[PDB]
Symmetry: C5
Subunit: 346 residues, 5 copies
Amino acid sequence: MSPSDFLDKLMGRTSGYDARIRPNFKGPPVNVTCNIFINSFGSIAETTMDYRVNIFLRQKWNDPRLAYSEYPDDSLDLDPSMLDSIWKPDLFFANEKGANFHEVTTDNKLLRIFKNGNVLYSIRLTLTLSCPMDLKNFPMDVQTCIMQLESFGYTMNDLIFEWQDEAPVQVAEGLTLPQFLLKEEKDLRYCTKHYNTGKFTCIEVRFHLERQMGYYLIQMYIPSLLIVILSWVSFWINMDAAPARVALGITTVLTMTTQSSGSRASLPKVSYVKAIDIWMAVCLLFVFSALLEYAAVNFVSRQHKVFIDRAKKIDTISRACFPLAFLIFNIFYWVIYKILRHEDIH
Amino acid sequence: MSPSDFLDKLMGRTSGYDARIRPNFKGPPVNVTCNIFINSFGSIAETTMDYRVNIFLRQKWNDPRLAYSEYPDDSLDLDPSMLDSIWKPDLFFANEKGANFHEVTTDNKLLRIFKNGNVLYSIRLTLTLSCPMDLKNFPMDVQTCIMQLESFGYTMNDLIFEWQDEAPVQVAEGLTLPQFLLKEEKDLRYCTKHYNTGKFTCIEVRFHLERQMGYYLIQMYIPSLLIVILSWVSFWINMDAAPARVALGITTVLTMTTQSSGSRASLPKVSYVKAIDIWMAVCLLFVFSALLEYAAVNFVSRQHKVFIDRAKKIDTISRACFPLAFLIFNIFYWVIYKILRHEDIH
Amino acid sequence: MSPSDFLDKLMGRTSGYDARIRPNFKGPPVNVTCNIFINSFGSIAETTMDYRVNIFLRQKWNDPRLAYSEYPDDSLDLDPSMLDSIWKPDLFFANEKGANFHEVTTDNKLLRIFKNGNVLYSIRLTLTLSCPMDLKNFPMDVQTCIMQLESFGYTMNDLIFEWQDEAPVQVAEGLTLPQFLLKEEKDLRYCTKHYNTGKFTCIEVRFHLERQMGYYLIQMYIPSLLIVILSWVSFWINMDAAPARVALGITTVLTMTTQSSGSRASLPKVSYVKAIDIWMAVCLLFVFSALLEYAAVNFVSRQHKVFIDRAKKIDTISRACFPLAFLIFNIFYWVIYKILRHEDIH
Amino acid sequence: MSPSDFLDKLMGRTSGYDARIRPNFKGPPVNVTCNIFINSFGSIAETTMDYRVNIFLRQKWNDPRLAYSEYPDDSLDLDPSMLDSIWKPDLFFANEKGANFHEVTTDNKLLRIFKNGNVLYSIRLTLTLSCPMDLKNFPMDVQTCIMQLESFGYTMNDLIFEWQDEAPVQVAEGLTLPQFLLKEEKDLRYCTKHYNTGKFTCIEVRFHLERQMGYYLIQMYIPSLLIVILSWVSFWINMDAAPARVALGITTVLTMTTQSSGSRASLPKVSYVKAIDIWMAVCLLFVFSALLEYAAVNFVSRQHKVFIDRAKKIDTISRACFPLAFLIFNIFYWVIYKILRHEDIH
Amino acid sequence: MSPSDFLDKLMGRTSGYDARIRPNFKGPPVNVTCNIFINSFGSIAETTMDYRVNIFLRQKWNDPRLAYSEYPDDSLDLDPSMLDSIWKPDLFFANEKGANFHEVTTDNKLLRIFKNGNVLYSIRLTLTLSCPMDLKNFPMDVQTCIMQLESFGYTMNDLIFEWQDEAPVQVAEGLTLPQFLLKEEKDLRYCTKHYNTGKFTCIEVRFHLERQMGYYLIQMYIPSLLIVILSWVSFWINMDAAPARVALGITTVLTMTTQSSGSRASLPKVSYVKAIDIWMAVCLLFVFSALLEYAAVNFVSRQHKVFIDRAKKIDTISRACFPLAFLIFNIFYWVIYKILRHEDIH
Ligand SMILES: *[C@@H]1O[C@H](CO)[C@@H](O[C@@H]2O[C@H](CO)[C@@H](O)[C@H](O)[C@H]2NC(C)=O)[C@H](O)[C@H]1NC(C)=O
Ligand SMILES: *[C@@H]1O[C@H](CO)[C@@H](O[C@@H]2O[C@H](CO)[C@@H](O)[C@H](O)[C@H]2NC(C)=O)[C@H](O)[C@H]1NC(C)=O
Ligand SMILES: *[C@@H]1O[C@H](CO)[C@@H](O[C@@H]2O[C@H](CO)[C@@H](O)[C@H](O)[C@H]2NC(C)=O)[C@H](O)[C@H]1NC(C)=O
Ligand SMILES: *[C@@H]1O[C@H](CO)[C@@H](O[C@@H]2O[C@H](CO)[C@@H](O)[C@H](O)[C@H]2NC(C)=O)[C@H](O)[C@H]1NC(C)=O
Ligand SMILES: *[C@@H]1O[C@H](CO)[C@@H](O[C@@H]2O[C@H](CO)[C@@H](O)[C@H](O)[C@H]2NC(C)=O)[C@H](O)[C@H]1NC(C)=O
């Protein structure tokens, strides 16, 4: 038996097969079972509020008109040359900003037809999916990325999207992301769009990502801590030496304002306040109060000797008060964020 | 009755249907009723003077030649395979810089034909629409984005664009923009282009966006206020200590010039002045006058003791004059902008 | 009379019409009358030496083979479906780096055929035209943008490009550019390319743009003036206080070098000098000479009291010499540039 | 014998050749022998975690149906006009983010058919292949780039990919990369993907790249060494002069924090620490301890003469202690990294 | 005689002309004579190691099958409608990273057929050609850009590429590049690729570009010279005033490190050292030695009056030693680079 003509007798003008008609035209809705295989993950830009992903989308459905028994082979691995002449679901990604196929040597498509009439349809896709991100608790935040698979033309009585009981979302082995950590577990919700044109099917997955804090502690917490400790040096400097103490005040706030403005380089402008802003605002208040303390002792020292020992008493108290009032804030910052970020796991 | 041949008898060579001829060729103009559904909104770049939007454009019109009665179904959900062989309006966006369709799995199109001959045509579009923006009152400004839907080839006697009485512009639930706030109400104007080639139909919507101020107060108002308060420390420093007071003058203007140049990072170069420039120019005049005040008291102190108490009197007056003259400016800046920005709601 | 067959009898195999043959094959050259309508203007990047423009290109020419008398309608508004099967001029833009059509819903084309056989052909185009820019007199410069419309395949004996006597270049109402001002008048030159392949027709327009100076005076003239005035404070400071005066010298040149390097952020590296460089070089010489003046008085003061009053005399003279020598330069800078920029209007 | 009809008799409807059927349909798997020729290499972006490469992909396989004996020519150099009508392997690159063909004048393809029925298929490709990079030991790191060639539709019983015994990967002569060094040797592994759809063939190459350190020593090691030596000047400055010594402390850490933040300009945010961070953290601890040493001697000097010589003793010890404790660290940094980077050659 | 049928009789099924067969199939190789016309030149990015160019590629060759005598016209200006149905060389650019055609209104192609059977084929192309650049002697370097035109499918016995004796490379009048100078003369080498697939023809041109130095002297030589002269002020300052002299030391190196890091903004990271690095390293050594000189005189001054005049002697010597040792370096830097850059013209 020739391989070429079997495609003609199975589908075409001779058999009356039409690619514009769904399998069960006036019967039960077509149940399309979908699953994905994340080949790559990355390019998560916070400013643009989206992320890039490369997936292998597989779809399975039953077509009674494509049932065959002539060839004894249980499966029929078919090239994508007739993929434009069989009926396919009109799946689309609702949160997608930009997508394209892959044609590096040939069409990156797979098609298989089984004896019972089922059809396996695999494709390679690159997506740039939008993600509404909440940047509160910025250095220590669990984000949730979204992915919706919804039909465009067919309603609930025509097309239904489902997952398998077996691994709907598989991730490639060894895929490690630079700045976050992909959780093993995933959430499969069942969205359903309700437009003025009618009802449409939809399926949704959730990806939980945890940001890595190490970079931020190396960049905007340890150097800011060093700057605050540096400002604490002024209590040990001689109270008479005015240019030295003011230089320790002013140069500290000089570098701190630049660090505060530079800590929000990648963050998209957001009206709410972040935990990083709380940290660098409290540290800026600490070093500004340190210079205002000198502005107090310098005016106290000139009141003309009970004003001399009183001037030294502020320096002695502040030597063992500013580190205590900063260690308390560190406890009230590194505990209230390891409690609440732990809360709201999902 | 077969599904395949009904499309042939309804339209094609057998029925004489032509896609190059409008429905009422020599009769009343075709009334096309349009509406949109904003799926996503964002990427509003001020430098490029445009914004990005992803919409679902729906068009409805009556075609007498497409009236059918053979199939008892009231509606006929048709795949987009014959969308290139029926008559469609030549709609285009006048303010569009760049647009494309979506073909992530199949064509993102919808087509429905009813018994009376009406046609429903839905499509998914991504647009980059130009927006003439006025950046005066920059930190607190209500912008207005524009969207025009105009025919390219047909005139008023052929094609007419209209909205429904029901929700012409619908926005997806949960769509929150990073830096602005989309008003619930919308304005539907009725533009009409008048070129040398004739008259053309047009319809226009207006989107009112309010910028969020929080980011700006965290970045270029609170740190500038801290810098001005820091410059006010020099009145409390000893008048004899020349290097300390000049260091408090110069380092203040050193950081202020960088902050003034850095406050216009994203703003496209604009000839008019902004409210941010007024704020940082007045604050720069305040800290420059503070250093010029020291330049006055230092020259007054050396005139050789009536010149000593006179020198101290300027410091005592300026301790309770600069905050008063700055609080008055704050009243004359945070009231004249909450009055006028409130004015001109549209 | 049917609408469909008239296109077949007017042009096609039955009538012998060929789209590969110009109307007057062995007669007078075809005169194509062109005009444009600038829908948008902007994205004038100085670094890349080009600008972006979106235009409506209209072309008019006579085709004797397309003359019709059967339909009583004077004009024949035709969809762009046969625009690929009629003869069209092979116009191209010589200074174009990148261009594309627009297909947001359908083809953005217009075609009209009149009784006498004339053809009106309108199209929507987006262009990125290169512009050779001269950046001398940078803050105050009149640039000239260029746009050439030239045939690629046909010579002078075949194709001739012309303008109308009526408004060849029309600009959309309300089009205001961010950083420049488009002059109302335009120049229509008549270029003619002379390659080794022969002679070709060409038509050229000129757009005169004036830069807006306000941004630059807010950024690199007023702050530099404030810095120079700040350096003039050192004459009023006590001559004995060495760290204060040197701090007023050094911090001034510290900020000035950064401002001089930062004033050429967008300017493409150019070998010639600009007016901004002249301004900031003279101001840098003024503040460097101010510190060298202190380097003179400090060495004069220690020569061991005729050396004391001599030291004070330089400070008293320089108090009323540096502003006079800077006001003279301001006159010799703001007059020699309002004379010469006024000159060379075209 | 005509050249045109031989292609028709060799393949087509007359001969029954089908491009949708692999050569040995129900026999042994088709063995495809592949090799590449790297025409260009570069654009290795660390932030995006990928690299760009332009290659000449050559594939060789046997087709019994294409065996010919009519033309005495041993080889048949065929234009790519029938490349779409013969069977070709569905090769694809697994780690590819973006790829395209080349059509600068014509299709950049080559096809040769020999007497025995073998087929040579050469193509020009541009790839943007993702590379999982490990940035530990950043200034001195051996990276490994990856390239996988895997079939999409055919399994192990159908398609098998192999290399030659002769030069599978050839590099163009004179190809020198800006920032790395391509090793002469290459590793050819034999990957095999195992998806839920079945087994697939795969072949993999490895490219070993060595970063060039010179740029980094000129930028963030020599200037940091100069800064640390500059901080060592404060031991030679007079212990009484408080503003001079604190200015040598503070300005040093002022520039060092900017250098530490600026050393990670191109590096993508990574949670682990790098060797550059170790270097600039130890140097920051050295200069911060130098200023804390002054904060110790200044407080020791005022205890009211056994406190004077004790104050000078710390300065004398630190003159010959800080360079010794820094030279030891240099030995413990430039040896532990020339041992371990040498280790793990592959 | 009709114009339409002559194309059919000259080429097509009736005449047996095949576009898949070269003119002399089993005879001498086809000699294709090529020449270019650079319409635009620019966008030479050093970081990406490539440049952009827009050219008019003209090719001339003889086709005996296209010889005609029926039409008395010596030349036959043909539209590009049959350019896909005649034989054309498979030219490609070996060093090209990205290229595209131009279709702004129609296809930007030209075709002419003469009586003897010769064919003239002109096309418009935009290229992004890679250029291996050597950045040593960066401010004053003669670069060489490359352009290779090589066949992809045909070998030496089939296709041969040649230039004319008359102007192979023509440049448009008035083309002035921003940052370099294009030499009038050009080098035409004769490359010949030798792959494992066989021998291929190739032709190569060379473009010599000279960088303009003016921008660099305005940016990183004159301000660095001013900084070094500023550091020379410290010799004239009083030796007792410690904070003034150290502030002149430290602020100088503070600005110099930023200038040294900022002088390599556009340069791609390169392991070798550049002339700019030599210049700013020597100037950094000069200002660091100036501060170390103060660190010497300050320690010499306190040795308890033979130590006082000895301290002043270093200041007096260094007043007339540092400018002499810097002028000698200027001679040994501005002569050794005007000798060697002059050498190696090609
Ligand atoms: C697609 O799935 C739906 C839901 O599982 C099927 O609908 C059910 O079909 C069974 C079998 O006839 C009925 O007994 C149920 O009453 C149906 N339920 C509903 C809610 O309709 C449907 O038959 C499936 N279609 C196909 C083609 O497999
Ligand atoms: C499209 O809408 C216009 C305006 O509503 C219609 O024009 C009117 O048609 C009615 C019915 O014949 C007339 O009585 C009016 O005089 C018309 N007004 C104008 C200004 O023309 C038009 O008929 C509609 N066309 C279709 C096909 O529905
Ligand atoms: C296109 O325009 C040219 C120039 O106006 C026309 O050429 C002239 O035609 C008139 C009418 O026959 C002659 O009297 C002149 O001698 C011609 N001048 C030249 C320089 O050739 C030409 O006829 C026009 N062609 C068409 C088709 O309108
Ligand atoms: C492709 O290569 C495989 C492996 O070399 C070949 O499979 C072998 O073929 C020989 C010859 O018939 C047998 O003796 C071996 O037992 C086979 N081994 C396996 C593991 O199958 C195969 O024949 C080759 N196919 C072609 C078309 O050359
Ligand atoms: C293409 O050019 C080559 C080289 O000029 C030609 O080859 C020569 O042809 C002449 C004329 O028959 C012979 O006498 C020489 O011996 C040939 N030399 C070589 C090295 O082959 C060739 O004939 C030209 N082909 C065409 C079609 O013009």
